[PDB]
Design a protein around this nucleic acid. Structure first.
Ligand SMILES: [Zn+2]
Lengths: 99, 208, 60, 82, 126, 116, 155
RNA sequence: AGGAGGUAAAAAUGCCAA
RNA sequence: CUCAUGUUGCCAGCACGUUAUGGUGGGGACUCGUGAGAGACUGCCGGGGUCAACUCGGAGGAAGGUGGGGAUGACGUCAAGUCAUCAUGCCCCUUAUGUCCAGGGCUUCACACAUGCUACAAUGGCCGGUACAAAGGGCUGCGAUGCCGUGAGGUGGAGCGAAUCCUUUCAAAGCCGGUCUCAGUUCGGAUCGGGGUCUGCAACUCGACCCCGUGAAGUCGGAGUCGCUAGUAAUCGCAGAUCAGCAACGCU
């Protein structure tokens, strides 16, 4: 058979949750096998910054950036499933990589 | 420097981001486009209160949501002002710009607009005490507002000194995370310099 | 910054090693992050305002 | 020290000027701002006026000065003591 | 079968239990080759000593993360929990010795303005 | 013993013993002993005149040490101070020649610390 | 400890010998954050003393200890502009700690080229009552007895 | 509630606006 | 701790591997990753408490009395700092106090202070073998096996937008064995001579690293003074931002 891997990248948590749900509902409406929303480790890119302009260096303030990931895999990609997956609309906060 | 920006204090819990899009390789271009957009919309129209500007980007198409006190001034009935602003947003080459102008329901419950109105008054000639009192009464009239604090600092009345005055009413729990605090800040242009007005409006709690 | 310098930083320099960063928002040559293209001050301001999608105050 | 694969660095401006002067065999004083060009064996007999940032100082090349940059022979900062 | 885990400052171990003699196998190596230290060996063997059931158990372990002392602590905790899973009445003796208490001591985060953890940079009021 | 003008220390392992030559260090001693064939763990007491000959021959053939090296070093310093190079002027004034911090440090070039 | 005493840490029993004093000695001779090194040094010292005397290393170490353990101390307090040395009793735990620290500190200053040897020699010497640690205990007792007049402060 | 005893070597100066 | 969860993550039970390893068909069992949830509330017992707060002790529990650490700076004070992030009232320049370029300087040194790093050695130096981490970074970037160099490094390009691949399967202290034998040394590494590599239009003023030689002060430091109360001090290594390359012994 053919294996189609769907990767979901998101900055917010509930966005990736909703996208995973919608993907699953859409594909299983067409009768295809899903492994499910397999989670992946979340990147954290940290940035430390001095709060004030002009010196006062010991006073800093830390930022972070979280990238949550879920893995969606469909088995036996029926052409109808593929056609639906191209037509699926999802929120901007989510990134869908289809391959 | 004492108190942090409440919106940034509550970003992950109570409040939400003013711009939603994801791009890794394009993050730089996206952010510089956003800065250009917000500078354009700030410098353009002061007449109608610009409460908030939200930007969404998906591939080539770009969506800009703006919340306004009075949309009648924002877009001409023939579409003149909308034409100007869309022409500028095409100058900023966001490719497709689907632009929506929205009206903020309660005007005096929005701290940004309250600060903007007090700045307008204090810039024309109005006494700062009168401005703060009018703002406080107007905000406290509406139901959802629980408490409000209004602060303005600078040269007040043309005095050659720096005075800071804050007026409070109700509850303003700054250190409470679940407290729904909406913050606003404007810098009033006067003849004696620029003076700032900060407003906190506390409207209940958010329980998730 | 001086607008001459701000503009000149975007011109194609005659040698590759002559180009630097100069934060987009304010033109501050020092302490500019590569991901945001903002200096530390503008990054803090815009992140507190919430206009970086994903940047949030950290505490661990 | 510049890598041997690249070869010595002499900028084309003064390279061509020195080539012209030694092709015409006339030893004229060269006014140059190039402190960053190494000395090549073709430079033994010529005299250079190199910029120290304030003025041009005459530098006469010898055999022992091969392999050094022109700028080494023009001191820049002036110290007399306290 | 029987499985259990012990954790001590970023050192996790999993212990599979076999009721044979008392040999030790830690990722293919014996208790003498893995942890060649007397204090650590005694830390590993202490719960068996207090339960008086030494050398009734063969165990196979998987030690990942942390270092030698951390892995010793993790293995001790896992051995103690396996003994509880074997016989519940062992709990009054085992837990009284504290062999069932996970040690919640971990490295303290380094804080800005300080050189590390809690040590502060040198100060002069002059 | 005696080697090319140097009285080697009484009891040292050979690889350390040769480092008392002005032009030899640990790597050079290991190279010399390995090339010649004499054990580097061998003491200086049991050293034999046949060995002394073979080390002397090899090092004289393949390295410039002692007075030759020392005079070459002062000759190079002399050349660079002669041609008036920046390094020559640094050698003259007695300051660091590799562009090192002179504002506070460089006491090893300035010598003993004299107060004002 | 303005609000009270701090709790005391649970010292463990030594594996090789079974005396917690050996582990306390290991901790006090510990340096640089290396427990295993100090453990091995103490083991070597005990083995050397065992070889030298033909007796029990733990017994001879204990004998050295109560030979160096002081009973009366000097605690200095300024009274009326002139500082006084006030004799004060010591509790057994403080005495054991003080003796162990004296033993190690004075053993590091010996001349026998290796700590695994200096420690054994100092322990043996104190067991015989001759070492610098024993001398230190003698001077401490002497200075405690020299100022019995000032014990009336009782602080 | 009543009440007793004990308790300090030396330590100078600081300009006249806001 | 429970439920859900099986890839690029684990491998207990099966098989196939044989050199090289979960490497591979397979398996949710134990990890682990990340979602949902339970769980500390003086909740229970005993004594003190005005029968009140609250406190002392005990049981259960992973944890017991704000569990540990972050984030979190009330009203104000210092005319505290910043007109050199930005913005701005007023004043000043406009043929310059605007702007372009080359060279130079911000690295100068008879000195003083302050923050650090390396040491002064044997709980150590050097040599050989060997065991254990977490957290990170990567597109005109990370760049492997291999070949050439002694070593910085060169050729080449496998594979990776990365739980896959590279940064080695990831460490150093640690352990085992050998040697040194208390000495200005097999300590210490500065300084200086020579020979190179790489980045870069360009390493002289003024880059980093490698090889050979060189081998200074320094024997635990005066009065005085600094940090720290448990995974804390002490040490050991690792990664990141800035960045073509680095003065990183700094900072996080
Ligand atoms: Zn900026």
């Amino acid at each position: 058979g053919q294996k189609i891997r769907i990767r979901l990248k998101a900055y917010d948590h509930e966005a990736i949750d909703a996208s995973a749900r919608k993907i699953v509902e859409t594909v299983t409406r067409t009768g295809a096998s899903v492994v499910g929303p397999v989670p992946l480790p979340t990147e954290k890119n940290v940035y430390c910054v001095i709060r004030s302009p002009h010196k006062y260096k010991d006073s800093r303030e830390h930022f972070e950036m979280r990238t949550h990931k879920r893995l969606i895999d469909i088995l036996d990609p029926t052409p109808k499933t593929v056609d639906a997956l191209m037509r699926i609309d999802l929120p901007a906060s989510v990134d869908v990589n289809i391959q | 420097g004492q108190k942090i920006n409440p919106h940034g204090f509550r970003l992950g819990i109570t409040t939400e981001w003013k711009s939603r899009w994801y791009a890794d390789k394009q993050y730089k271009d996206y952010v510089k486009e956003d800065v250009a957009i917000r500078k354009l919309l700030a410098t353009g129209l002061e007449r109608a209160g610009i409460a908030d500007v939200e930007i969404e980007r998906t591939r080539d198409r770009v969506r800009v949501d703006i919340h306004t006190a009075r949309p009648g001034i924002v877009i001409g009935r023939r579409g003149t002002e909308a034409d100007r602003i869309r022409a500028d947003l095409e100058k900023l080459t966001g490719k497709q710009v689907q632009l929506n102008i929205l009206e903020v329901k309660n005007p005096e419950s929005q701290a940004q607009l309250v600060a903007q109105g007090v700045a307008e008054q204090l810039s024309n000639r109005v006494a700062f005490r009168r401005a703060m009192r009018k703002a406080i009464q107007s905000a406290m009239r509406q139901p959802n507002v629980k408490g409000i604090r209004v602060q303005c600092s600078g040269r007040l009345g043309g005095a050659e000194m720096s005075r800071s005055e804050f007026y409070r009413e109700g509850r303003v729990p700054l250190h409470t995370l679940r407290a729904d605090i909406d913050y606003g800040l404007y810098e009033a242009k006067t003849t004696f310099g620029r003076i700032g007005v900060k407003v906190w409006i506390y409207k209940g709690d958010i329980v998730g | 910054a001086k607008k001459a310098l701000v503009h000149k930083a975007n011109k194609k320099p005659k040698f590759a090693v002559r180009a630097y960063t100069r934060c987009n928002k304010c033109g501050r040559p020092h302490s500019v992050y590569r991901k945001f293209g903002l200096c530390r001050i503008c990054l803090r301001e815009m992140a507190h305002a919430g206009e970086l999608p994903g940047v949030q105050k950290s505490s661990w | 020290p510049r890598s041997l694969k690249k070869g010595p660095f002499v900028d084309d401006h003064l390279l061509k000027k020195v080539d012209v002067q030694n092709e015409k065999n006339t030893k004229q004083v060269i006014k140059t701002w190039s402190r960053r060009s190494t000395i090549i064996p073709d430079f033994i007999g010529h005299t250079f006026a190199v910029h120290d940032g304030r003025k041009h100082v005459p530098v006469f090349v010898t055999e022992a000065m091969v392999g050094h940059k022109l700028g080494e022979f023009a001191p820049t900062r002036t110290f007399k003591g306290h | 079968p029987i499985q259990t885990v012990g954790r001590r400052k970023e050192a996790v171990v999993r212990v599979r239990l076999v009721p044979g003699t008392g040999q030790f196998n830690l990722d293919g190596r014996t208790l003498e080759n893995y942890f060649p230290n007397k204090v650590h060996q005694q830390l590993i063997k202490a719960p068996l000593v207090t339960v008086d059931r030494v050398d009734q158990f063969d165990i196979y372990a998987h030690l990942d993360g942390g270092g030698p002392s951390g892995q010793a602590g993790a293995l001790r905790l896992a051995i103690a929990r396996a003994l509880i899973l074997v016989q519940p009445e062992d709990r009054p003796a085992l837990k009284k010795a504290g062999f069932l208490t996970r040690d919640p001591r971990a490295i303290e985060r380094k804080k800005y303005g300080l050189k590390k953890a809690r040590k502060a940079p040198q100060y002069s009021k002059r | 013993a005696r080697l090319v003008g140097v009285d080697l220390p009484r009891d040292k392992r050979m690889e350390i013993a040769l480092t008392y030559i002005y032009g030899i260090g640990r790597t050079r001693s290991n190279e010399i002993l390995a090339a010649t064939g004499i054990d580097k763990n061998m003491r200086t007491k049991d050293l034999t005149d046949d060995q002394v000959t073979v080390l002397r021959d090899y090092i004289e053939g393949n390295l410039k040490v002692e007075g030759d090296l020392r005079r070459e070093v002062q000759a190079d310093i002399r050349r660079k101070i002669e041609i008036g190079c920046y390094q020559g002027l640094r050698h003259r004034r007695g300051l660091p020649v590799r562009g090192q911090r002179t504002k506070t440090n460089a006491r090893t070039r300035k010598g003993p610390k004299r107060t004002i | 400890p303005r609000k009270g005493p701090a709790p005391k840490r649970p010292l463990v029993n030594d594996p090789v010998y079974g005396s917690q004093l050996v582990t306390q000695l290991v901790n006090k001779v510990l340096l640089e954050g290396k427990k295993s090194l100090a453990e091995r040094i103490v083991y070597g010292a005990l083995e050397q003393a065992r070889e030298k005397t033909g007796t029990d290393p733990v017994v001879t170490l204990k004998r050295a200890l109560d030979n160096v353990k002081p009973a009366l101390e000097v605690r200095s307090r300024r009274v009326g502009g002139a500082t006084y040395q006030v004799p004060v009793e010591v509790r057994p735990d403080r005495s054991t700690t003080l003796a162990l620290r004296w033993l190690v500190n004075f053993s590091r200053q010996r001349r026998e080229k290796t700590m695994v040897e200096r420690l054994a020699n100092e322990i043996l010497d104190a067991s015989n009552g001759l070492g610098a640690s024993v001398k230190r205990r003698e001077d401490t007792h002497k200075m405690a007895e020299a100022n019995r007049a000032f014990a009336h402060y009782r602080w």
